[PDB]
Write an enzyme that holds these catalytic residues in place. Structure first.
Site, PDB file in Angstrom:
ATOM      1  N   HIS B 128     -34.691  43.770  30.049  1.00 21.64           N
ATOM      2  CA  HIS B 128     -33.513  44.279  30.724  1.00 21.64           C
ATOM      3  C   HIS B 128     -33.966  44.987  31.972  1.00 21.64           C
ATOM      4  O   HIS B 128     -34.021  46.205  31.985  1.00 21.64           O
ATOM      5  CB  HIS B 128     -32.799  45.283  29.824  1.00 21.64           C
ATOM      6  CG  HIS B 128     -31.394  45.577  30.242  1.00 21.64           C
ATOM      7  ND1 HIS B 128     -30.890  45.190  31.467  1.00 21.64           N
ATOM      8  CD2 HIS B 128     -30.385  46.198  29.596  1.00 21.64           C
ATOM      9  CE1 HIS B 128     -29.628  45.566  31.551  1.00 21.64           C
ATOM     10  NE2 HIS B 128     -29.295  46.179  30.431  1.00 21.64           N
ATOM     11  N   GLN B 131     -32.125  47.570  34.046  1.00 23.86           N
ATOM     12  CA  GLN B 131     -32.060  48.855  33.345  1.00 23.86           C
ATOM     13  C   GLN B 131     -33.385  49.599  33.518  1.00 23.86           C
ATOM     14  O   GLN B 131     -33.403  50.828  33.652  1.00 23.86           O
ATOM     15  CB  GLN B 131     -31.724  48.659  31.849  1.00 23.86           C
ATOM     16  CG  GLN B 131     -31.703  49.934  30.992  1.00 23.86           C
ATOM     17  CD  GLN B 131     -30.312  50.544  30.827  1.00 23.86           C
ATOM     18  OE1 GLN B 131     -29.431  49.950  30.222  1.00 23.86           O
ATOM     19  NE2 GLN B 131     -30.121  51.741  31.360  1.00 23.86           N
ATOM     20  N   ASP B 225     -32.170  53.506  21.424  1.00 20.05           N
ATOM     21  CA  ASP B 225     -31.147  52.474  21.527  1.00 20.05           C
ATOM     22  C   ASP B 225     -30.568  52.357  20.119  1.00 20.05           C
ATOM     23  O   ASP B 225     -30.823  53.219  19.277  1.00 20.05           O
ATOM     24  CB  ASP B 225     -31.767  51.152  22.009  1.00 20.05           C
ATOM     25  CG  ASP B 225     -30.732  50.114  22.409  1.00 20.05           C
ATOM     26  OD1 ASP B 225     -29.530  50.447  22.480  1.00 20.05           O
ATOM     27  OD2 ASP B 225     -31.127  48.954  22.667  1.00 20.05           O
ATOM     28  N   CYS B 267     -29.414  54.115  26.553  1.00 18.21           N
ATOM     29  CA  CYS B 267     -28.873  53.098  27.462  1.00 18.21           C
ATOM     30  C   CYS B 267     -27.412  52.799  27.179  1.00 18.21           C
ATOM     31  O   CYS B 267     -26.742  52.092  27.949  1.00 18.21           O
ATOM     32  CB  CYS B 267     -29.667  51.812  27.346  1.00 18.21           C
ATOM     33  SG  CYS B 267     -29.898  51.342  25.651  1.00 18.21           S
TER      34      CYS B 267
END
Lengths: 353, 337, 340
Positions: B128, B131, B225, B267
């Site tokens: 990602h 991110q 996460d 996130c």
């Protein structure tokens, strides 16, 4: 209903113009469109983004999702200083419980221009007839006019050698899809030599050829045969679409192959048979291996991707035309405008809560 | 070729990432204060989602607007990724730049390879990267006290998600001290650590352990996460709890154990009660929402970079342009139907 | 308190509404004549729909474009308002990603939860409770259509049919403006006492009025006749011939009904209309129908509503012109001098 008759074209308006089929446009008018479209292309190709549509809102109505068509419009608008509004297949209703008369009337108060990828052609014209703003036909079950123009531009850009267009040969192989019909409808318009070759079962019908005939009685054109490996000869452009049926009687898988995979497939041999530098065209998407082999579509003579870009090239110019035209006919009072502006300024400068 | 993509930060040097952070942040400060840099006037971005993602969608859609552009949404079904070779080739003629939230990473790079315009990885099953950068910016904005970053400790708690891997991939890039602690079953694999190792052999970084309540100590940033599996072995309700709800949950105690002013990152979205207690995420040391805003902060700058880069390499003939414009003017001024 | 929302007109005074109408209309006249006031340059609006609504969507999406902005569509499923992620969270992070928010929510409670937890202005696209962005579109419409030395405060607005949120909103706004309101409708489907309580409160301040049950008499002397559809509450969506059972005696707006009201009583409908049911075609397509102007005004009003909320938000949250100037130079220099 209007209680009149109306088949496939819309009632004209004295104060606006639609784009439902090229049957309503003259050769010269189409020439205009190609030039406009192309002049704009050259500007944007080189970093100048003509803001011809500042702040103008386009409503896009899809009844069958179409990414190529959607992003083409959405983009065309941005480049010209406008916006494209997507009313997804379900988002809209068009004829869901609210009459097109109603939907048309209120859409006319909320956007500046309309485009619609409709399932049944009848309803695209119903829309064009009942709306007070210009309407564009994204594609119906009948024709694909925004493609007729994209492909005209493409052919213009690719004449090779002192052939002047009016004397080019355009050949369509395969099913008589609306893309097919549209290609004939436009090439005949421009006084070219058209031919649809295809299986006894899937040729353009007499009611359609009737229209093609009419076109050439005015332009100097031509059309059609059934026996392949001979009508491709001397072709300047070889064009095909896919073999699926009519998004309702479709996908027999090996049944498509049954009817078309003798000839009707565009391979190098077929290409060579046509001409040394016959360019290849396809409106996409292409099922490689079926209507065309990879060596052809990815070949040196393939222009199917320029053609693809030109889908935008042409909607870019088509939007400008319709809007410009709409503004003549419906021009702003520069005085009323000036006052309206001062009035607003003063209000903002002086009033609050 | 004459263009550049953003598929993983493995292709970017520490210095390049620094550039990006600076660019991203300079732009942030302008917009924060009412100046909207129109660096992308009239440019069209095509957004391809295979799995809807509002946070990611509106971030791009917005970033584009602020910079004078537009973001085009090709909904999960709307698109297709017709061979990718074809899709890529024709998309390149219709938009200026591309982003794609793809299910299988392989296809995001297939796209990047076959398109002639810059491609951005919205997020795959692998990493990602949009991110990684949003989070770098966030950490920069939050160093507390003469720690210079290169010597901050970043700790990730929980499952080895792509978010996790990306975090390590970026922190090691910048020469920081990384650590993923997590259950014997759900740690970053050797093939992944291989990559992390390679990063530190160049930057002076570090990584990993299994025993919690000790690797959190001295952490400057604590990051987590969610515990769900891989959107396919979308793990079990009370089975997630089985493996992770001993430790692995970020609560005040866990926070305190890390440091007095260890900042918390997530996130998002967060399942409160599971991977983090409310007192933490809503706490004085939580920056998860700045981090969130920075998702935009970074794609804002990422877009500018790729495009600017694309323009060098592919620069307009100012002459041809001038004529093309006059030609158009004349045509419009003189011709009609 | 450093921002303002638009959830119901119960929070706005008559004067404030007047401001809004004026602003909305001044903007209308500018755009009507080719001037597109770029009051919202570069500003991002987030649109949250839980029940798709084309008229409302394209209205906003468009309003933004005309004013130099953009409307972002978070389709019904795209979002999740309260989906495993608390509104508190959704609100907080949405506030960092767009400049302003609109939401067509199913349950009113959550539209306000959103307004309360977001730091940016929130607009109510329509809930199960009211439709405030329509109250204003309709106010503008009635202003534009007073005929003859009636000053509004003394116009009669009559709503026929079911007590829908559109209905309630209409009374909520007409009473606000000191007009004479009346909902006539079947014993079973009238505005409830808890709702009239609110209407009453409005008139104790403005000089208004309301209500009856016996038709063919309350329509008399009406300046505006307004109706909506007979379907139920998108859940007890009724019954086909059961709707007809209750309403198709009277309660249908036909020419006779129209004539009974007044010679030049104008007809209003928030659309969409099931022709033949709540209104005959000869009426809605008649010389006295303004339902389509009203429709255009849906935009006319959201156009101005967005401007107000944003302008208001900027006062309260004004930019440091200095900081701004430096930020800009800083950026220029960076771009002019740095690369990779």
């Amino acid at each position: 209903h209007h209680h009149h008759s109306s088949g496939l074209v819309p009632r004209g308006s004295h104060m606006k113009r639609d784009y439902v089929t090229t049957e309503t446009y003259t050769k010269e008018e189409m020439h205009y469109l190609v030039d406009l479209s192309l002049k704009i292309k050259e500007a944007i190709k080189n970093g100048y983004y003509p803001q011809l549509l500042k702040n103008k809102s386009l409503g896009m109505i899809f009844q069958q999702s179409s990414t190529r068509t959607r992003v083409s419009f959405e983009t065309a608008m941005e480049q010209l200083g406008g916006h494209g509004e997507y009313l997804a297949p379900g988002q809209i209703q068009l004829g869901g419980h609210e009459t097109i008369e109603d939907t048309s009337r209120v859409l006319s108060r909320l956007v500046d221009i309309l485009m619609a990828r409709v399932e049944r052609h009848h309803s695209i014209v119903d829309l064009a007839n009942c709306a007070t703003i210009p309407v564009i036909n994204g594609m119906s079950d009948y024709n694909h006019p925004t493609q007729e123009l994209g492909d005209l531009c493409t052919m213009v850009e690719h004449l090779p050698e002192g052939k002047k267009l009016e004397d080019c040969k355009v050949v369509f192989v395969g099913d008589a899809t609306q893309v097919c019909f549209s290609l004939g409808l436009i090439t005949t318009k421009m006084g070219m030599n058209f031919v649809h070759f295809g299986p006894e079962g899937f040729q353009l019908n007499e009611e359609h050829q009737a229209k093609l005939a009419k076109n050439c009685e005015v332009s100097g054109g031509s059309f059609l045969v059934t026996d392949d490996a001979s009508s491709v000869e001397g072709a300047d452009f070889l064009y095909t679409d896919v073999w699926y049926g009519l998004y309702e009687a479709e996908l027999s898988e090996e049944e498509r192959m049954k009817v078309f995979y003798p000839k009707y497939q565009v391979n190098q041999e077929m290409m060579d048979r046509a001409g040394a530098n016959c360019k290849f065209m396809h409106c996409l998407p292409a099922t490689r291996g079926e209507e065309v082999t990879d060596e052809v579509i990815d070949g040196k003579n393939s222009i199917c991707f320029d053609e693809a870009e030109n889908r935008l090239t042409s909607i870019r110019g088509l939007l400008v035309y319709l809007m410009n035209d709409y503004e003549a006919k419906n021009p702003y009072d520069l005085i009323k405008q000036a006052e309206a502006k001062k009035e607003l300024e003063v209000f903002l400068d002086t009033q609050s809560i």
